[PDB]
Amino acid sequence: SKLLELLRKLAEALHKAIELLEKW
Amino acid sequence: SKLLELLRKLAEALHKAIELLEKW
Amino acid sequence: SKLLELLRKLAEALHKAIELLEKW
Amino acid sequence: SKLLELLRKLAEALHKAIELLEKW
Amino acid sequence: SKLLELLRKLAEALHKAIELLEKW
Amino acid sequence: SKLLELLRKLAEALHKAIELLEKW
Amino acid sequence: SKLLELLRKLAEALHKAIELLEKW
Amino acid sequence: SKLLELLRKLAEALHKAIELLEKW
Amino acid sequence: SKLLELLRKLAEALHKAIELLEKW
Amino acid sequence: SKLLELLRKLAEALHKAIELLEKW
Amino acid sequence: SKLLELLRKLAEALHKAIELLEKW
Amino acid sequence: SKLLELLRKLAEALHKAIELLEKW
Amino acid sequence: SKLLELLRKLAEALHKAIELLEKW
Amino acid sequence: SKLLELLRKLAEALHKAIELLEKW
Amino acid sequence: SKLLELLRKLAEALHKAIELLEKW
Amino acid sequence: SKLLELLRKLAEALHKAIELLEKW
Amino acid sequence: SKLLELLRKLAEALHKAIELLEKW
Amino acid sequence: SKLLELLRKLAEALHKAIELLEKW
Amino acid sequence: SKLLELLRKLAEALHKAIELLEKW
Amino acid sequence: SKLLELLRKLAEALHKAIELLEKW
Amino acid sequence: SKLLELLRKLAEALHKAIELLEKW
Amino acid sequence: SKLLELLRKLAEALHKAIELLEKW
Amino acid sequence: SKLLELLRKLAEALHKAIELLEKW
Amino acid sequence: SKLLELLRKLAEALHKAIELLEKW
Amino acid sequence: SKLLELLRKLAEALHKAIELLEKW
Amino acid sequence: SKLLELLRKLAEALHKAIELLEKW
Amino acid sequence: SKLLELLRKLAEALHKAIELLEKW
Amino acid sequence: SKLLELLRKLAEALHKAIELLEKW
Amino acid sequence: SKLLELLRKLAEALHKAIELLEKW
Amino acid sequence: SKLLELLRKLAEALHKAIELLEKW
Amino acid sequence: SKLLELLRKLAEALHKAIELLEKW
Amino acid sequence: SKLLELLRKLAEALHKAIELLEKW
């Protein structure tokens, strides 16, 4: 489930990315 | 930035949805 | 309760989404 | 937008409704 | 009093809802 | 549809009733 | 005295109710 | 329907009456 | 004059009320 | 029913009297 | 001439009152 | 009861007098 | 019609009045 | 005393006179 | 004495009534 | 002002009139 | 105003007349 | 005295009343 | 007797009522 | 409080009137 | 019985209403 | 005391009011 | 069909609503 | 049970309300 | 009717949510 | 399964919802 | 306009995400 | 294939997200 | 704090991603 | 923006990287 | 294949590197 | 190919990431 790990990780990248955008 | 706040709700929704997917 | 928590996220999201629509 | 205000009212209701079901 | 919080929301909804229905 | 007027006014009573009751 | 607000709104319901009922 | 005509009048009275009481 | 309007409302009520008692 | 008829006259009178006060 | 209309209500009241008096 | 007759008659004078005044 | 009604009453007053005067 | 008799008679005369006048 | 005072009360009002009528 | 003098005298008479008849 | 001569004469008569019967 | 004044006013009444009737 | 009470009350009301109206 | 003493009085009267026709 | 019960309900409503208005 | 009574009355009134208009 | 249902529901709701807030 | 009954009442109210809104 | 299809959908969801917690 | 229904419904709602929002 | 492109892609992902998890 | 499409969906949105972030 | 949180997630994405790449 | 150099580099890397693992 | 081994190692290195960086 | 592009972007990350760490 290499792809499953990536999908949870991609969710993490987006979450932090948007938080920063929202702040700014 | 309420369009950005909607994005954040969508972002979190994907997260919870794929978090479930990853564990199942 | 991982599907129920996904539902809690999604609930929050739609509320703020429609609040944004009304605001915009 | 009064039809939108009904939709935002329902959204608030659903989020709280599912929050309560989810806590249970 | 979470059940009371849900029923408060349903009352708010119905106000805008039948307002709209009668008006329409 | 003065019956619609009655339903909307019974809604007024019920919404005031619940907000007061939910406080209590 | 949001109880006074409830009584006045229950009056609203009753007055609409009786005018409709007295027609009938 | 004379009894209904009296009770219609009592409802009208109570409107202005508790309006006034709450307002006072 | 809202206190006068309550008094005129009551007057209308009493006249009708006694008219009904008098017819009986 | 001569006292009851005097009451019917007097009922009418007070109504129009207070209506006049409100009008003047 | 609503002050005159109040007078007429008073006039009729005296009439009914004394009509009773005369017969008794 | 000479005075009783006069009082019913005085009521009659006034009643007609006011009707004419009201008209004019 | 009504003007003639006043005049009938004027006469009536005087007749009951003189009946009283003469009774004494 | 006979002055009161004439005076009653003249009251009665005008009443009867104008009873007819009004008819015509 | 009250019966005489009522005769005087009617007179007072009727003097006023016809004083007015004559000037009109 | 004849109309107001009439009103006071009407009221005087009506107080007296019904006071007198009420016990009887 | 030949007929208002008559009206006025009738009132003037019943003034002095009722004065006399009440003064007895 | 006031009886001859009663008779004076009855004369004025009669004079105008019967003048009318002949003028018809 | 209870009916006399109603009429007695109405005379009392009319007195305070006219006190107000003439006072204006 | 003239206008409030009037309101109170009107209410007492109506209560009695209706109490009797509720029995009747 | 249902018309009688409605009026008995309006009596309780108006009773409580005016009691509190007499306080305020 | 008095406010809780007035709310109980309005509820009882509106139960009865709507009972009857559901039948009509 | 549907309107009578909605009125019956609002009555039943408001019975329950006021039951509970009378206890609270 | 009373909180559950309140929510069941609001379910019936909202059911009927939206059914009719979907018609209109 | 986009906005009304949205309203309908929101309602269906809330009904299911509450139906389950009414059982629970 | 009934819970999956709720979430399935919410995805469907979100699709029509965003169709509207992006379309603006 | 990056924000709207993000919104459409979020929705695409969330439709797909939960479609995929729902049966599983 | 849907699991791969979700990876691409997250990417599309995240490209958009950081494109925006970098220009901000 | 939050900016450092993004950076941790950026790394995570790449590690799950390269794990997948290398698994193939 | 040395740290925004780093941010941008990380995204550019994961772009080509995920392109390659999805293209497999 | 050994290219993928180095590339996994560099991902892991940056994750570990910045884990510490962020702490400090 | 795209693996050497992955490695190019990992180098840019590393260069900036470790520059930061030495600059602390």
Question: What are the residues whose beta carbons fall under 8 Å from the beta carbon of O18, sequence distance 6 or more?
Answer: L17, Q7, Q8, Q11
Q: Do H17 and U20 touch (CB under 8 A)?
A: no
Contact criterion met (CB below 8 Å) for AE22 and AC9: no
**L10 and chain O in contact, CB less than 8 A:** yes
3-state secondary structure H1-24: CHHHHHHHHHHHHHHHHHHHHHHC
Q: What are phi and psi of Q23, to 5 degrees?
A: -75, -30
Would you tell me how many other CB atoms lie within 10 Å of the CB of residue U23?
9
Cα torsion M2, L15, O21, Q12: sign: positive
3-state secondary structure X1-24: CHHHHHHHHHHHHHHHHHHHHHHC
- Encode burial over AC2-11: b for 16+ CB neighbours within 10 A, e otherwise: eeeebbbbbb
What is the resolution in angstroms?
Answer: 3.7
CA AB17/CA AB14 separation, integer angstroms: 5
Question: What are the residues whose beta carbons fall under 8 Å from the beta carbon of E10, sequence distance 6 or more?
Answer: D13, F18, X7, X10, X13, X14
Number of helices (H) and strands (E) in chain AB: give both, helices first.
Answer: 1, 0
Q: What is the largest CA-CA distance in chain K?
A: 35
**Which tokens in the block code for residue AC18?**
């390269």
Question: What are the residues whose beta carbons fall under 8 Å from the beta carbon of T9, sequence distance 6 or more?
Answer: S9, S12, S13, S16
Min Cα distance V15 → chain W (Å) is 7
| DSSP class per residue in Y1-24 | -HHHHHHHHHHHHHHHHHHHHHH-
CA R10/CA Y21 separation, integer angstroms: 96
**Which tokens in the block code for residue J20?**
């006049």
CA T3/CA I3 separation, integer angstroms: 7
Q: Do W13 and X13 touch (CB under 8 A)?
A: yes
Q: Do AD20 and AF3 touch (CB under 8 A)?
A: yes
CA AF11/CA AA21 separation, integer angstroms: 37
**Which tokens in the block code for residue Y12?**
């269906």
3-state secondary structure J1-24: CHHHHHHHHHHHHHHHHHHHHHHC
DSSP category for residue R23: T
Min Cα distance Q12 → chain M (Å) is 11
Closest CA to L24 of W11, O23, U24, AC15: O23
O9 three-class SS: helix
Touching Q (3+ Cβ pairs <8 A), the chains are L, M, O, R
Question: Can you list the pairs that W19-23 forms with residues at least 24 positions away whose Cβ atoms lie under 8 Å?
Answer: W19/X2, W20/F21, W20/X2, W20/X3, W20/X6, W21/F17, W21/F20, W21/F21, W21/F24, W21/G6, W22/V4, W22/V7, W22/V8, W23/X2
CA E18/CA H6 separation, integer angstroms: 30
Q: What was the elucidation method?
A: X-ray
Min Cα distance G19 → chain W (Å) is 15
**V24 and chain G in contact, CB less than 8 A:** yes
Residue with tokens 């009178």: J13
- Encode burial over AD1-24: b for 16+ CB neighbours within 10 A, e otherwise: eeeeebbbbbbbbbbbbbebbeee
Backbone region of residue P23 per phi and psi (left: phi > 0; alpha: psi in -120 to 50; beta: other values): alpha
Nearest to K2 among J9, J10, J24 (CB): J24
Residue with tokens 């470790």: AF18
- Encode burial over G5-20: b for 16+ CB neighbours within 10 A, e otherwise: ebbbbbbbbbbbbbbb
What's the one-letter identity of residue AF9? Answer: K
Contact criterion met (CB below 8 Å) for AA7 and Z21: yes
Would you tell me how many other CB atoms lie within 10 Å of the CB of residue S22?
12
Contact criterion met (CB below 8 Å) for F17 and W21: yes
CA F19/CA W17 separation, integer angstroms: 10
| DSSP class per residue in chain S | -HHHHHHHHHHHHHHHHHHHHHH-
Question: What are the residues whose beta carbons fall under 8 Å from the beta carbon of O21, sequence distance 6 or more?
Answer: L17, L20, L21, Q7
Contact criterion met (CB below 8 Å) for AE14 and AC14: yes
* H/E run at residue P15: helix P2-23
DSSP category for residue D8: H
Cα L15–L19–L21 angle (5° rounding)?
115
Contact criterion met (CB below 8 Å) for U16 and T15: no
Q: Closest-CA residue in chain W for X14?
A: W6
Burial class (CB in 10 A: 0-12, 13-18, 19+), E8: buried
Burial class (CB in 10 A: 0-12, 13-18, 19+), AA23: exposed
CA K23/CA L4 separation, integer angstroms: 9
Nearest to AB17 among A4, A7, A18 (CB): A18
**Which tokens in the block code for residue P8?**
């006071």
Closest CA to K10 of AE21, P7, J5: P7
Q: Closest-CA residue in chain AF for AE10?
A: AF10
Nearest to G13 among F2, F3, F12 (CB): F12
CA O6/CA P16 separation, integer angstroms: 7
DSSP category for residue AC1: -
Contact criterion met (CB below 8 Å) for J7 and S11: no
What's the one-letter identity of residue J19? Answer: E
Judging contact as 3 or more Cβ pairs under 8 Å, the answer for A and J is no
Contact criterion met (CB below 8 Å) for T9 and U21: no
Residue with tokens 């007819």: N20
Backbone region of residue B8 per phi and psi (left: phi > 0; alpha: psi in -120 to 50; beta: other values): alpha
**J2 and chain K in contact, CB less than 8 A:** yes
DSSP category for residue AF23: T
Nearest to S7 among J7, J17, J21 (CB): J7
